[PDB]
Amino acid sequence: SECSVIGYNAICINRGLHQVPELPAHVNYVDLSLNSIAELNETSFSRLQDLQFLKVEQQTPGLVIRNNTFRGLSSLIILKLDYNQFLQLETGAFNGLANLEVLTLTQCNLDGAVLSGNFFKPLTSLEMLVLRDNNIKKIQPASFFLNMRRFHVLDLTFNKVKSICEEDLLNFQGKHFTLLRLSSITLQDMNEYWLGWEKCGNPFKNTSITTLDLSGNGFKESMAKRFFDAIAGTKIQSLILSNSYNMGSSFGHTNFKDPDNFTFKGLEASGVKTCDLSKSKIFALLKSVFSHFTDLEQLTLAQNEINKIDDNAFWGLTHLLKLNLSQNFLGSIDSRMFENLDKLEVLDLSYNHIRALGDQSFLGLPNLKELALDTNQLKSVPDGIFDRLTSLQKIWLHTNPWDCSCPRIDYLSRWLNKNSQKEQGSAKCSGSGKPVRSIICP
Amino acid sequence: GQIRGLEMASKNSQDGISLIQTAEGALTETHAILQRMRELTVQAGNTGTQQAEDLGAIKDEMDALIEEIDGISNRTEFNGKKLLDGTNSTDGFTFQIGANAGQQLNVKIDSMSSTALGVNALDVTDFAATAFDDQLKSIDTAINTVSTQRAKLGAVQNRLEHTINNLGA
Ligand SMILES: *[C@@H]1O[C@H](CO)[C@@H](O[C@@H]2O[C@H](CO)[C@@H](O)[C@H](O)[C@H]2NC(C)=O)[C@H](O)[C@H]1NC(C)=O
Ligand SMILES: *[C@@H]1O[C@H](CO)[C@@H](O)[C@H](O)[C@H]1NC(C)=O
Ligand SMILES: *[C@@H]1O[C@H](CO)[C@@H](O)[C@H](O)[C@H]1NC(C)=O
Ligand SMILES: *[C@@H]1O[C@H](CO)[C@@H](O)[C@H](O)[C@H]1NC(C)=O
């Protein structure tokens, strides 16, 4: 035999094959990736009726899949045809695949007709469709999607999609997606003066989404506001807007606006439980900016350019448990910054430039379990700063230039010694390099 | 002894993957900077005649963004080797992934500096000398270039994933 056959698995990778090889009838897993198969047809898999898992990824460019190629593979659950450059599908290529659950077609130069034509009509049990990195410019699923009742995962990452509107996504109405990944599709036409805004309606009408990934799409504030107004009411549990590269003003520039209280108003009825706005050049957290996220439990703003947090920035976040502000440009913390966060359990302030903590910085945070202040520029803290943090389980204070002069260091050294089971890593004195916990002031 | 050879080809394949991932990460940063530049350029083009004072603030930001592109181009490294400054781009990176000598994989990555991408000369205060459409086109060509380089690396990564599965079998 040409391939390596172990039990139920035929591994046929990179064997210089020009056709499907001869294999034991009992194999149910076949990997034919990295071969030179130019054409597949109904004879190709006619001796392998028991296949459950089939890969034919990244052949020489131009693979042709004829009608009924997989007809009679009525046990096939997973089919992967990724990285077939200039893949040529006949419209009945997937005939017979009523039980297929996963189809992957990443980077196959496919266009929007692959969703609007009859290619996927036979796939009545389909659960997951991966179409990343193709040439899909509009997302317009054909009417048969209405009856694909287990369909719940779609990934269109890296397609250059001009715009999405209610009329495009019609045939996804009524679905519950567990994952809708529309990352880095750009949506270039949907700008400030586009007439499509008046008629766009709600792209996600009567659709619910557990995880909506809209990362890497720009989302200039004015665009975000329009987009979230358009989808108002859509139930979304987890919203990913990381790498929204137009959203923030940026540190030292005012060409663009940071989000404000009106930006996310459309999300008020969405029930969002987690939100990721990391890596989006945000400079200022403005008054009530997050107050429409009435159900929010986790929020990351990591890796922005945040240097300014307005009073009442977190107003209305009465359910928030976790707040990540790691890797920003904060120069200090004061007690007003973190008002309106009574339920907070996890506060990450690591990798900032913080050089001072205001006297009662954490007074409004009695439920805090985890507090990261590592990798900042703290030389000292005010006496008693951590005393009311009665639920604290972990604290990071390392990689800070602690001034271990006495009596300045008295409180912190005594506190870190008394609470040595909470400290993660080891806070060290500038100069001497000894652990802060070991300093005894007389 | 044949087992050692498979173990070696596999480790070298994983390392190719980590290298490619580092480059993909940096390229997605470049891409994001370029799209922000595009958006700033669009906003500049839509700036009224009475609002011409805004153009200098836009140029200031784009100039800093062009600097960031160059910072990425110059610092991005794996295993002590620069990935995106073009300095390795004629030889490329070669991985020994075959269970015998000859079976080999070479990856070329072009320079992604602002000069190599042709976005160095952008100037939103000077649509009178270098047309808005030409400046926008420069930015779109640079976006296409970065995106094509990323796609190319995705194909090679996929090849390396399959080679690892192959060696394991
Ligand atoms: C806050 O977000 C940061 C940035 O995303 C998270 O940083 C990651 O941290 C993990 C574990 O420490 C590392 O393995 C990753 O490499 C980090 N990613 C980056 C991009 O730096 C951090 O974990 C988050 N904090 C909390 C408490 O979730
Ligand atoms: C598939 O192609 C071969 C030629 O390679 C042809 O003879 C065969 O009839 C085709 N199969 C079917 C089911 O038509
Ligand atoms: C493939 O199948 C479609 C629909 O099932 C059919 O209309 C067509 O005749 C077939 N195409 C070719 C080129 O034979
Ligand atoms: C949404 O879809 C469900 C499932 O088809 C349907 O029964 C319901 O009537 C729809 N609701 C609206 C408001 O269109």
From TrEMBL, chain A:
Glycans are attached at N41, N67, N206. It is found in: Membrane. Disulfide bonds join C3-C12, C165-C200. Belongs to the Toll-like receptor family. This is Tlr5b protein. It comes from Danio rerio (Zebrafish). The gene is tlr5b. The chain holds residues 23 to 390 of 875 of the full protein.
Automatic annotation (TrEMBL), chain B:
The keyword Secreted applies. Its main location: secreted. Keywords: Bacterial flagellum, Cell projection, Cilium, Flagellum, Secreted. It is found in: Secreted; Bacterial flagellum. Residues 1-88 form the Flagellin N-terminal domain. The keyword DNA-binding does not apply. GO terms for cellular component: bacterial-type flagellum; extracellular region. It comes from the Bacteria. GO terms for molecular function: structural molecule activity. Belongs to the bacterial flagellin family. Flagellin is the subunit protein which polymerizes to form the filaments of bacterial flagella. This is Flagellin. It comes from Bacillus spizizenii (strain ATCC 23059 / NRRL B-14472 / W23). The gene is hag. The chain holds residues 54 to 222 of 275 of the full protein.
